[PDB]
Design a protein around this ligand. Structure first.
Ligand code: 1FB
Length: 811
């Protein structure tokens, strides 16, 4: 009997432990449910909830039994429970001194339902008595599931309604939030025949009876819906729908749809038309707005079968799209194809404005056609020279994808496009030879080229690819060569001298410094720490000097003991991901991340102009131009992130630095997350936190827009709009949820107030910037009426403050 010689390991291991001692089963009677339902209707977070949601919460409450002289909660212990007193008396001890005495009906431990907070007073049981109670985890999880199943349920019913079929993913999700649940008991008329109603209804649970002229036509089941046409048109109800058993309906109103989405026909058509236009390689390079304008101004026409829609008698049509039916195309007498639903024709005539229309288009059956005329293109492009404008725009689409040109003013970008010269190359011509100093940026018009270095091939590039952009910013040897790998390769190109006549010092300095810093490789041993520029529980931030290039950087150290202690294992990598991917001028730019036995490193550009927190405090109350500049700058950064499905979640002046030139840099992406569906976790700084985060029913990127309104209020008015005096988190959230927004008598600008009120709208659906148009509604608001957004991005504005000298306070 031999023994095992190789090793088996041992197994290892506050307020929730105590309540387990008092926990007990008890069947909930009618007297209990009604006192819970009463007590929750007066609660801070639960007051907004409907009866079915409060009924669900009431059942998750648990019974706890106490003898006299028993401890419930202790002042200093971490807070986790909320209580409604069922029987007996309970005394409240603050600093070991009796303040109050509570009986049946009263509640305590309110703040636990929002966050883990330290208890203020010690509650003790005077007599023998019992508590109804619920824990945060259970309360938040229940709130999550209620709102989240509601959303997913409603989105399926949106997907089942045919009128929404041509909405995009993002459009369908946005109208899902406009759904309102409406309950009907038996006997109740949902809709009456003859009324001009503007509401779609969808049966989730139950059954209803349909009456036309007081006669039973049919019965409707869970899934059935009615009122699609009521969202498009003013038309009377064809029937009287009456509920037969207790029923629950999801519903969209046209009034809220118009606020959220705009006109439904206009939005639907724009999608149909955008999809049809994108099948052409020409319109594929148009902007979303340009395609939307073509959709809004397109002539739409119904034709009978065997009709000559176009015949070489043409009404200046350049492009044709089939919406319904079929048409046959002819060149003289030869059929060249049949276009069905969604297909289109005319690329040849869109490109060549002056060409005679040689084709014939004959309807095969009854059809609906959209027609884009010569004027419809000119009004879209803003120019009567269509061929030149399409060409100009083709080039613009190429360069707007590059950082170097993306943020230049439209006037500068146009000038630069106009300056493009064209040249041709024989096969085997060295367009660029490595080692030589370049002065030209190229875009390939026609053909192919092959990139090489020290002999070996690296890549192959073709129509609309580009190369050599660095030569515009630097005087340096070309790292690779570019050989022509086709017969008659044509390139557009622009000289450095022309680029320097267009771009001005500030933008040029920004590009010079930025492109260079990522280019230069870095190792830890090459960096010397000059001085510490930031401290905290996270770790430290050092100002560092790179010996080889002499470029100065910033190096954040995140201690490993900090991350593993608070269970932020998965979060530090998601921060690395987000922080590395950001490539916007008003967001901090990462260079590289290093790994270490002690701390996680982040190396970024050095920002020398200090925090915005201090800048506004030097300025005092900001004027209209100054608030426009800073808020405008924050808007561009947040918009960039929202387009990449990132919600920032911690917007405050502290997290915004200023550079040498006085332009903003967003930092600290610790609270930031890649949004996939609805977020529920409670994060951020309480004074800037949106009411939808606090209420636990789901939030998205809209929270950063609330915070924007908080910042604007600080800029114009001075103090915070909510809980300015307050230190207790509970009383801040209370002021955020139910407090009054007021504005000082010295705030004389109507438009400023209007914007602040609309950014600080509690319900997101009514919050400016949160509809389908996104930030467009903020940017076009009267407050920004004289503000050139174009010049902000391109560094062509005088900023409010320029710092004299420097200012400081897988991996
Ligand atoms: C002033 C402080 C410490 C908040 N800060 N944070 C900064 O932002 C950093 C600095 C290094 C790494 C990361 Cl991920 C962010 C920063 C900077 N780039 N330049 C100067 N000061 C900086």
């Amino acid at each position: 009997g031999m023994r095992c010689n190789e090793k088996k390991k041992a197994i290892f291991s506050g307020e929730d432990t105590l309540m387990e001692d008092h926990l007990q089963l008890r069947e909930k009677l009618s007297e209990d449910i009604e006192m819970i339902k009463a007590s929750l209707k007066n609660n801070l977070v639960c007051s907004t909830l409907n009866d079915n949601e409060i009924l669900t919460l009431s059942n998750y409450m648990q019974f706890f039994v106490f003898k006299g002289g028993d401890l419930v909660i202790k002042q200093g212990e971490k807070g986790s429970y909320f209580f409604i007193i069922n029987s007996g008396k309970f005394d409240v001890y603050v600093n070991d001194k009796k303040v109050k005495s509570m009986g049946k009906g009263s509640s305590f431990g309110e703040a636990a339902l929002i966050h883990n907070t330290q208890r203020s007073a010690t509650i003790m049981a005077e007599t023998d008595g019992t508590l109804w109670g619920v824990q945060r985890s259970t309360f938040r999880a229940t709130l999550k599931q209620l709102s989240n199943r509601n959303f997913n349920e409603n989105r399926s019913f949106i997907d089942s309604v045919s009128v929404f079929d041509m909405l995009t993913e993002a459009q369908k999700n946005m109208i899902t939030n406009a759904c309102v649940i409406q309950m009907f008991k038996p006997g109740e008329t949902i809709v009456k025949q003859g009324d001009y109603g503007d509401v779609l209804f969808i049966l989730k649970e139950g059954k209803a009876t349909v009456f036309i002229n007081d006669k039973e036509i049919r019965v409707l089941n869970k899934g059935s819906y009615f009122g699609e046409r009521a969202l498009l048109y003013d038309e009377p109800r064809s029937a009287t729908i009456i509920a037969k058993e207790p029923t629950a309906c999801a519903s969209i109103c046209r009034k809220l749809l118009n606020i959220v989405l705009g006109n439904l026909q206009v939005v639907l058509f724009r999608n149909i038309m955008t999809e049809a236009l994108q099948q052409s390689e020409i319109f594929r390079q148009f902007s979303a707005e340009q395609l939307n304008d073509l959709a809004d101004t397109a002539i739409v026409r119904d034709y009978p079968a065997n009709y000559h829609i176009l015949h070489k008698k043409v009404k200046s049509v350049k492009y044709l799209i089939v919406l319904e039916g079929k048409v046959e195309l002819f060149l003289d007498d030869e059929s060249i194809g049949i276009l069905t639903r969604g297909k289109s024709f005319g690329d040849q005539y869109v490109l060549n404005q002056k060409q005679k229309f040689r084709h014939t288009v004959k309807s095969l059956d009854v059809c609906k056609i959209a027609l884009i005329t010569e004027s419809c293109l000119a009004d879209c492009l803003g120019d009567n020279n269509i061929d030149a404008s399409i060409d100009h725009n083709n080039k613009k689409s190429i360069i707007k994808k590059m950082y170097i040109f993306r943020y230049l003013s439209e006037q500068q970008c146009n000038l630069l496009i106009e300056a493009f010269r064209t040249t041709r190359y024989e096969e085997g011509d060295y367009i660029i030879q490595e080692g030589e100093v370049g002065s030209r940026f190229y875009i390939i018009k026609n053909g192919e080229v092959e990139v090489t270095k020290n002999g070996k091939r690296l890549r192959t590039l073709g129509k609309n690819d580009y190369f050599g952009e660095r030569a515009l910013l630097y005087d340096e040897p070309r790292t690779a060569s570019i050989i022509s790998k086709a017969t008659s390769v044509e390139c557009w190109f622009v000289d450095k001298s022309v680029f320097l006549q267009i771009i001005q010092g500030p933008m040029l300095t920004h590009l010079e410094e930025r492109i260079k810093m990522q280019d230069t490789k870095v190792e830890m041993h090459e960096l010397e720490t000059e001085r510490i520029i930031g401290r905290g529980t996270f770790g430290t931030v050092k100002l560092v000097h790179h010996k080889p290039t002499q470029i100065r950087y910033a190096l954040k150290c995140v201690s490993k003991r900090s991350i593993i202690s608070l269970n932020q294992q998965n979060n530090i990598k998601l921060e690395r991901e987000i922080t590395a991917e950001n490539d916007h001028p008003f967001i901090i730019r990462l260079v590289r991340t290093f790994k270490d036995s002690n701390c996680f490193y982040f190396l970024t550009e050095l920002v020398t102009g200090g925090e915005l927190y201090d800048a506004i405090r030097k300025l005092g109350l900001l004027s209209k131009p100054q608030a426009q500049f800073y808020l405008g700058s924050i808007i561009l950064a947040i918009e960039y992130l929202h387009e990449r499905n990132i919600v920032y979640r911690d917007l405050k002046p502290e997290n915004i630095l200023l550079d040498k030139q006085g332009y903003v840099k967003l930092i600290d992406f610790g609270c930031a997350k890649k949004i996939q569906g609805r977020a529920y976790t409670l994060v951020g700084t309480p004074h800037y936190m949106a009411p939808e985060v606090i209420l636990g029913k789901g939030y998205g990127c809209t929270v950063d827009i609330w915070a924007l309104g908080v910042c604007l209020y600080e800029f114009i008015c001075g103090p915070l709009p909510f809980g300015n005096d307050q230190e207790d988190q509970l009383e801040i959230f209370r002021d955020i949820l139910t407090g009054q927004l007021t504005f000082p008598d010295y705030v004389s600008d109507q438009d400023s107030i209007n914007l602040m009120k609309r950014l600080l709208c509690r319900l997101p659906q009514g919050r400016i910037g949160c509809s389908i148009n996104g930030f467009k509604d903020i940017k076009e608001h009267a407050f920004f009426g004289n503000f050139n957004w174009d010049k902000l991005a391109g560094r062509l504005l005088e900023p409010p403050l320029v710092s004299k000298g420097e200012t400081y306070a897988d991996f």
